[PDB]
Amino acid sequence: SHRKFSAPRHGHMGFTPKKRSRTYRGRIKAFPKDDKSKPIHLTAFLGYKAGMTHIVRDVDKPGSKVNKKEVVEAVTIVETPPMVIAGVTGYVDTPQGPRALTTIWAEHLSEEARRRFYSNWAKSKKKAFTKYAKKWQDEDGKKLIEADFAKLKKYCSSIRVIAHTQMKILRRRQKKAHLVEIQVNGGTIEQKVDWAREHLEKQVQVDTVFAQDEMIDTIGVTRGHGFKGVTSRWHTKKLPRKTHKGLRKVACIGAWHPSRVAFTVARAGQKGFHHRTIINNKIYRIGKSALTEEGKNNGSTEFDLTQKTITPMGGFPRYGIVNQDYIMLRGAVLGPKKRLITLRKSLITQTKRVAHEKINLKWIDTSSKTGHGRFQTTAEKRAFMGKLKRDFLAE
Amino acid sequence: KVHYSRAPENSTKSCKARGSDLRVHFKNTHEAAMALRGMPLRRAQAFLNHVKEHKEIVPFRRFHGGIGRAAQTKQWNTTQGRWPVKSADFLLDLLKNAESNAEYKGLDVDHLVIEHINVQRAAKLRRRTYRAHGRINPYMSSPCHIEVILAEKE
RNA sequence: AGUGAUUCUGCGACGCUUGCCAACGCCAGAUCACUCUGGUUCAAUGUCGGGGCGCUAAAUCACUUGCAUACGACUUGG
RNA sequence: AAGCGUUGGAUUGUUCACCCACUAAUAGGGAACGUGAGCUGGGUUUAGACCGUCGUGAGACAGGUUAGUUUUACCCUACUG
RNA sequence: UUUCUAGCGAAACCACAGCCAAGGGAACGGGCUUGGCAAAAAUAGCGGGGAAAGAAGACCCUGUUGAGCUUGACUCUAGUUU
RNA sequence: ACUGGAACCGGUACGGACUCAGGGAAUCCGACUGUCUAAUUAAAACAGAGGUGACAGAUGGUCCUUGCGGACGUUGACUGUC
RNA sequence: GCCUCUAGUCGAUAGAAUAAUGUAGGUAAGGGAAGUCGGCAAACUAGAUCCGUAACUUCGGGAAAAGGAUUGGCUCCAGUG
RNA sequence: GCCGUUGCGACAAGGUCGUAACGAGUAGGAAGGUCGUGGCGGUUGCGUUGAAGGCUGAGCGUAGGCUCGGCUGGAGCUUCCGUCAGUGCAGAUCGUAAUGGUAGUAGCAAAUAUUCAAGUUCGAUCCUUGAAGACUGAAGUGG
RNA sequence: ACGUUUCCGACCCGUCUUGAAACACGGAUUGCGGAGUGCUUGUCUACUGCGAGUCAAAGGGUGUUAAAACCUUGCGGCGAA
RNA sequence: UAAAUAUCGACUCGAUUGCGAUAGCGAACAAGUACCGUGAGGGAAAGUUGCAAAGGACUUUGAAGAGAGAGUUCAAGAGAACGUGAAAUCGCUGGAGUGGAACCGGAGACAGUUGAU
């Protein structure tokens, strides 16, 4: 018999199976279509979700009720220190897809880049790339490397640079770097290979990959919640209070025939830690490293003259201090704080007005995110609260 | 009372030890003993002490219905193991007896290897358990016979 | 030196051979009539011994980390 | 052309029915009249009890009414991880 | 509590066993026919199926099988009246 | 020993925990207290006080016992049972 | 009811961890029965002093009807042999 | 071609042989059984130089079953002729005894709670001593 | 040959049933036990002895490898109308 | 008012085409016992070392059970729950197979077994 009253099914079946992501790092499943006319550029970057704040911005949106009016908007900070280009690889089309043709590594690879090849780096002899490094300063090795570069220039249809994050500058526990393959867009294959060769061992800043008021994509793994029931995993209706044997379940998990449980029914299992790709996150600001003169006050604006950095009072909770370049995206970003986010250039030809809208920040909230912060700076806090018993005893 | 399932290759440079109707769970002790196959005597004793200290796991290869998973299980190329302390104690006592037998026969104790080991089910002991609606069900213990043959390895 | 859908080609150089006539001229060849020999058929791999250049690593447990976690697993450090 | 939707309620155990309101629309159906080791137990459908009619009586009544125990998965498969 | 560990340790159930579509068949197959397919060993849940388990259907019918009760059924009888 | 009163004091509050009916307007049933299907029905079912009727003056009435004999009855109509 | 003294016990297989489902407790913004056969379950009320208390009634009740105010500590005053 | 049944026939035999045709089978009926089991009256033999019983290779028979070999075992067993029977099991939710998968699984969760040091011991969460922390709370976990 | 591998065939037995592999019932596994019998009375059939007869009963006599065997009937049963 | 007649309930005897420890009486044995029910009453299971205890002295590890040697013995693999010791079920060693059943009949091959005056 048909169900008495219609109702849409719970959940999106195209996001199943709800299983733990195969990898901790976000896999880039597609890259933006390559246009040969545009200048050579990278198509992706890596960062860490530091935390969230809110900002006040003047809105320029003709026809809207908030035109020429200030609005408060929540934003996410992603710390994106410069990435080191460690290798170049290329792909050749075959009747079964693109296939990696060869990979050329830089002569000198950072210790934190080589750590990624290890599970017990400290306990090992650290022999990775030791023989490869000697090829660059050898007659035959140089010939092989040049032949590989020629193969890349001659046969490949797409070029990717292997780039790795830098972890020592962050002054945090982890030292093992993250490696990723970023496709190079723009220019012909020969120009791409030459550009990668020049940039081998060199640092790339985020502002050379992304621009202001640009819509990007965030690829990563969402916050994990462990094993969860159907009510919290699929958002099914709770059963009446009088239910025997539990009410946080699905009453009927299938009809008599077919005499099997279908894959479309809600079942308890892992919730969270799923791979996701969210599109159309707008960039509200690209701030410089706070350790440089340009970034001394990367938390201030043209109309808020107080000299402050982006890091909130007391530091970013559970993350640390953002002392490197950062991107302020609008809205929420997948994963918890400290999660590694893969930022990717949009594959769409943006046409909506919100894609080209100019962002004019008037103020950035910096108060403490532990508790209810009343002040934007320690200087303001001390000025308001005057002098304390500690100071009096210090005198 | 229980004959050895095997005979030593050369009875001169070998010793034997036995135990019958031991009140230790047969399945647990059988898995623990099968974990000891081929080990040198000192390695076997160290392994049993590690099992007692939770530093090494006994892999449950046959009676693994409902057994949990652990990290130490990787070293045995399986996914289910445990730490049967009572079985470890009984096997340690048996190995001590075999060591004493080797000393008695005048063999180099530091070159002994476990040539043969076997565990067999013994006669069960009977107890009662009381169930709902005035019913009584058996509450049985499953003891084992344990036997070991050590041989001098060159 | 060329070939990218990774092996295969062209050019050499060097080795080992390879054709016909005198001419079955001359020697050798036979297992008795066939029963698995091409009258030792060919391939694939494993292992054990001698040599020729040639190299001198990692996982794992246990601690630790918490972005992860029913247990395994996952992310870190020595 | 079944891709996607086809609702909130009053009365009734009700499926149906009827009305109130909103709505893009308030379409019709199957899956052992889908779905009780998923629930509930209002009805039906034991034993207690009351009324009407019937029967000399015990008792009868898809006539009405009130109260009336809802057991077991640790196995195989399927499904979820 | 479940979960994992140390110790201890049952029971129900069990022809043989356990992936499906259609067909035909005792008219709703795990086995048969034609197809879809098909790769160890396992942990935690689950309640679609096993027309799952509990019980020689308490419903209905049959039996020249009963029993409780009733009476204007047949045949008797304690008691009582004469 | 309990009762009444006055000033002052604090703090989210004073029966500071604890202990202990939510209230009202009606309909149906049973008057009420009470009793009952131990292990699915606590009820409108039974009882009940009150009402009516029947029989019985003892050589009697109602019952039990195979019989002998016995109970109401240590009773006598304002009694006894139905 | 809660705490304590004399007296008596720590006997209920233990350890780690705190997933789902569960059993038993504690809360929940705005709305307030729209849930459901049905306000099932839960919440609400409550002690004491003063005031006030309807229909109906067998005049005995209804009645704690309904519904209001007060309540702590400290320093004092008065009354009651 | 071989096996057997039926009919016919030859042969001095309860037997052998020849010959032609034939060969489905539930319920059921007959026949043969040097198929098997346990007794009795007789007969033929074997056995501590290893009987019965038990495990299992070389064979025989269409089959029921049988013979021999090897190992275990330690005291009985057996041919054939008559005759007798408590004479052959896969089932009966069969009787009785034992044993599996489930399975090292369900589970050992009400009654607030234990900790430190020491003693004894081969061995102590659980026994004992001391210190601490809690509970029953006099209509008690008391007498 | 109850080992392995190939090609063909191959649904689980017993039972009631028109029809069972059945989503019909019994059957988890193994050992041992387990069901047309005794007797009385008929009838037919086969064999044996005698034959218008046959069998003889209870009983008696004898018998000591004495519950046996052997001997024994004016009369009794069946048959001869 | 004896005899011929009935009857193994009691006492004492002799036999058997009967059963051979799930059979035969319920009871081959501390059997109308253990145990169960308030009671009337119900009611089992349970035979076997060896000719002879000669029932394993002594050494050794362990707290001990127990084990390794040794000894007794025709024999202890007859060691006390002891004659024999089956099937189901189970563990080990070696070989071989192993894609959602497994088993099975027919026909080869392989491994293997066996015979050849």
Side-chain angles (χ1 to χ4, degrees), chain A residues 44-62:
Chain A
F45 215 79
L46 288 183
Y48 319 89
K49 182 175 158 176
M52 297 193 64
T53 44
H54 61 272
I55 58 90
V56 169
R57 79 180 175 96
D58 207 89
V59 168
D60 157 50
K61 197 185 319 193

Side-chain angles (χ1 to χ4, degrees), chain A residues 261-279:
Chain A
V261 192
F263 81 119
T264 40
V265 196
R267 322 235 69 190
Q270 171 78 28
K271 187 194 158 106
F273 208 78
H274 304 315
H275 191 270
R276 292 292 185 267
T277 305
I278 321 303
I279 64 152

Side-chain angles (χ1 to χ4, degrees), chain A residues 1-2 4 6 18 233 245 251 256-257 261 267-268 270:
Chain A
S1 325
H2 65 285
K4 211 174 208 33
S6 190
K18 292 167 142 7
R233 195 198 194 204
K245 308 134 128 164
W256 193 320
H257 280 110
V261 192
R267 322 235 69 190
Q270 171 78 28

Side-chain angles (χ1 to χ4, degrees), chain A residues 7 32 125 145 190 201 235 284 309-310 324 330 358 363:
Chain A
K125 312 291 295 296
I145 285 152
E190 297 57 1
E201 304 197 51
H235 306 109
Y284 274 21
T309 68
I310 195 65
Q324 311 288 323
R330 101 154 286 194
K358 309 294 190 23
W363 177 78

Side-chain angles (χ1 to χ4, degrees), chain A residues 58-108:
Chain A
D58 207 89
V59 168
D60 157 50
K61 197 185 319 193
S64 173
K65 270 59 130 155
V66 303
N67 197 29
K68 322 270 199 34
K69 284 166 202 337
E70 276 166 330
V71 305
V72 168
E73 305 219 312
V75 302
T76 316
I77 305 303
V78 184
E79 177 172 29
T80 72
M83 275 174 91
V84 179
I85 297 277
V88 50
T89 192
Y91 287 77
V92 55
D93 280 356
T94 82
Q96 300 97 10
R99 189 193 58 112
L101 185 59
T102 201
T103 303
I104 305 102
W105 297 90
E107 185 175 343
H108 316 289

Side-chain angles (χ1 to χ4, degrees), chain A residues 84 86 106 108-116 121 129 164-168 175 177 201:
Chain A
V84 179
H108 316 289
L109 282 178
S110 159
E111 216 144 58
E112 31 189 39
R114 306 205 295 286
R115 280 174 176 265
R116 174 57 56 183
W121 160 272
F129 293 92
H164 74 81
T165 66
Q166 320 182 74
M167 321 287 311
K168 214 216 159 312
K175 297 141 167 178
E201 304 197 51

